[PDB]
Amino acid sequence: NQYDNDVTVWSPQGRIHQIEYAMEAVKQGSATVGLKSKTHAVLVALKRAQSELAAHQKKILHVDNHIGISIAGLTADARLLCNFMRQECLDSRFVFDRPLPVSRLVSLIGSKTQIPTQRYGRRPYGVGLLIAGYDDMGPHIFQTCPSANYFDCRAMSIGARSQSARTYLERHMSEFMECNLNELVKHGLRALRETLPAEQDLTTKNVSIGIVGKDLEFTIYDDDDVSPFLEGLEERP
């Protein structure tokens, strides 16, 4: 308990406990799944409500015309990271008149989130991001961790009880590439269902879907607009 109070203290096992504690903040966040196909990248987020008289917390944020993220963890840190990424995407347009490639944006955010993990009195960003984008290289799904380490994933899932969604994604990863947009969104919703308890089910209130494609701008779909995606999938066993 002496090696875990600061982010600049290496534990004798070669680990930084503050970074792992910040990583646990993502595990405390609500589940979200980001998966891609040959032409599309979609994010499905299970919004959480503190009480039934309060709105469900938004998890999918629009970053750029071709890039959108799903957050898990501290919402204020998520807003800070989203503002940084929006500013970087806007500066790319202002300078090169071109969209910022997703692979080249996640690198900047992983370099930005690494600085606090090495300086005294700073803390890692207690937010994990699932970035879905499209560029000349096709669709991209990236997972950004509080450890400032990012992964280029075929299909990722982060948040509370997200490993069931990881299992579903691993089982059906082979058919993600060739399936159309509707099948991809249904796969994402089915993966997100694995994170729910047995009695709970996907409703329009707690499902948000962010889609980006080759000729399709990044669009976020909510309660009214989620129904065209939810009604297709059958009831789980």
Binding site: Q2, Y3, V7, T8, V9, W10, S11, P12, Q13, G14, R15, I16, S107, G110, S111, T113, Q114, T117, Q118, R119, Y120, S147, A148, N149, F151, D152, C153, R154, A155, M156, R166, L169, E170, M173
Partner: protein, 240 residues
């Protein structure tokens, strides 16, 4: 005991324990080797896949800090990428100031000093990654340096960083690297990486191959997929 909580604190035996813990962080990662042959340097990385969900190319431990320098990292990948950017900016500044590609000795001595700058103060922690910089040029020749979390940069003929570093070094010592060319050293690097890999322990690794030599006109590039697959087949066959 309080003697290891800061990098600005010396142990009663005169050892900075924070640097040693950062070194252990490197020793907890997968093995990356690099062999300097007669006409170039070849980098191989045993990049494990933690899950099938990561795409083929994620967590690339082989970097390009310049057009003629490649970097193989082991340890904290975030610190590894930070140091890769530091080396990239160092090479860019060298080119923008002196007007030519930075010699590998100078790039190693500069990035190593940047690393050492993090091993003196309690305001920062030592980098948790060790990296090898490899390069080739017609004038200087093939060069291969390794830099550890402490900031010690040493030139090498064959080096390995990771948890199987000792076994990899034992396998490397069998090679007559000073005479063979890159086209054979890639096969031998694949063989060594496959030998030191532990399948019963963390398994399902990917072989990340790169090189810089006269056959690439002194340019660090990923080994072409055909050559990489031939080396993979040779390495698999060598295991019987």
């Amino acid at each position: 005991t309080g003697y290891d909580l800061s990098a600005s604190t010396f142990s009663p035996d005169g050892r900075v324990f924070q640097v040693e813990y950062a070194m252990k962080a490197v020793e907890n990662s997968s093995t990356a080797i690099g062999i300097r042959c007669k006409d170039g340097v070849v980098f191989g990385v045993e990049k494990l896949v933690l899950s099938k969900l990561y795409e083929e190319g994620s967590n690339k431990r082989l970097f390009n800090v310049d057009r003629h320098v490649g970097m193989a990292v082991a340890g904290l990948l975030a610190d590894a990428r930070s140091l890769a950017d530091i080396a990239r900016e160092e090479a860019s500044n060298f080119r923008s100031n002196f007007g030519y590609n930075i010699p590998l000795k100078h790039l190693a001595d500069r990035v190593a000093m940047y690393v050492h700058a993090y091993t003196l103060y309690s305001a920062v922690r030592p980098f948790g990654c060790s990296f090898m910089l490899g390069s080739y040029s017609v004038n200087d020749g093939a060069q291969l340096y390794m830099i550890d979390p402490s900031g010690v940069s040493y030139g090498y003929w064959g080096c390995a960083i990771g948890k199987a570093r000792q076994a990899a070094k034992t396998e490397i010592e069998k090679l007559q690297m000073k005479e063979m060319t890159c086209r054979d050293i890639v096969k031998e690097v694949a063989k060594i990486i496959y030998i030191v890999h532990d399948e019963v322990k963390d398994k399902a690794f990917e072989l990340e191959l790169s090189w810089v030599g006269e056959l690439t006109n002194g340019r660090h590039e990923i080994v072409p997929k055909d050559i990489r697959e031939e080396a993979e087949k040779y390495a698999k066959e060598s295991l019987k």
